[PDB]
Symmetry: C2
Subunit: 195 residues, 2 copies
């Protein structure tokens, strides 16, 4: 037997009746532009939130789990992020209160070619300045934060970038790896949050 | 900073202020044998069905089995060994099936817990009339017993004879307490 949920029904309709710059601002719910491996941009919608975790759904019904631009888990993709520990200590949890020099240590678990990998990541946030981004035809002033990350065994280091709304703290754009310095992910959050 | 999810929008469209015949699964919910409440299926994850109810309430189930509740007066916080519940394969159920698990719920702001043991026993064939459509079901009675304090009760589940899907269930939110009646309406 099979049931029909509202999320599936209205999600299908969205992709069956579709991006228009005016239609984006007309969508009542949050949406995002996803880019994997510098690949092609795909449209994702925010289906629901559980324990401060935002679950975004694509057309192929793949799922992305995040918290204020930070990627915490993925489902139904070629390669998936399986876990991120000590996520409650991520500075992005209070993006406006991030001080230059913020640090964070956690471990991640991700699959690569159906093989499980993991590593210990330590990073520091560095204020890169102010920047205005145009998203869905609107301007947004962002505090640009550059996260210098270093993992070990093997020793690797890369940089993630997070564009924060200087008034709400909401991340409007982010660039990060899905694993330890591997599988770049780009996300642009279209629906702006008010004060 | 806040976000707008599709569930938030569905809620604003249905409960934000006080229908029928919709393109998705729905359900008639009845608590403590009170008034019938209209519930809808919001989404599914990990084989769990998350229903949406008024006042930001939520009910999680799996083929007729209540597995959790949110934002209600008294909530079912957890049920273990769910993958072993016979309802998982309602058609493969023989008169005398058993199941053991622990439940966690909250009564009048107090948190309680208990280990449950039950056995299924056939109660006869029955035709249910749901949404003007007849449906032949295998009525399954479930004798559940616990201890400290000792207590037992009966759960009744209506399994579609051919589909194996529960279309109506009657059970307790907690140990022998808080009756929950659910009638599942197909999308059509």
């Amino acid at each position: 037997h099979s049931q029909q949920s509202m999320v599936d029904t209205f999600r299908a309709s969205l992709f069956d009746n579709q991006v228009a710059d005016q239609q984006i601002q007309a969508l009542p719910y949050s949406t995002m532009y996803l880019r994997l491996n510098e690949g092609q941009r795909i449209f994702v919608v925010l289906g629901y939130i559980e324990q401060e975790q935002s679950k975004w759904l694509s057309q192929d019904n793949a799922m992305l789990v995040t918290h204020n631009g930070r990627l915490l888990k993925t489902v139904k993709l070629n390669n998936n992020l399986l876990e991120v520990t000590n996520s409650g200590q991520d500075p992005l949890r209070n993006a406006l209160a991030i001080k230059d020099g913020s640090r964070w240590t956690r471990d991640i678990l991700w699959s690569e070619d159906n093989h499980f990998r993991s590593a210990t990541l330590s990073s520091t946030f560095s204020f890169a300045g102010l920047e205005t981004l145009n998203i869905a035809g609107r301007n947004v002033l962002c505090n640009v934060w550059q996260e210098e990350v270093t993992s070990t065994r093997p020793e690797k280091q890369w940089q993630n970038t997070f564009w924060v709304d200087s008034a709400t703290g909401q991340v409007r754009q982010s660039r990060q790896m899905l694993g330890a310095g591997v599988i770049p992910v780009e996300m642009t959050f279209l629906k702006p949050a008010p004060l």
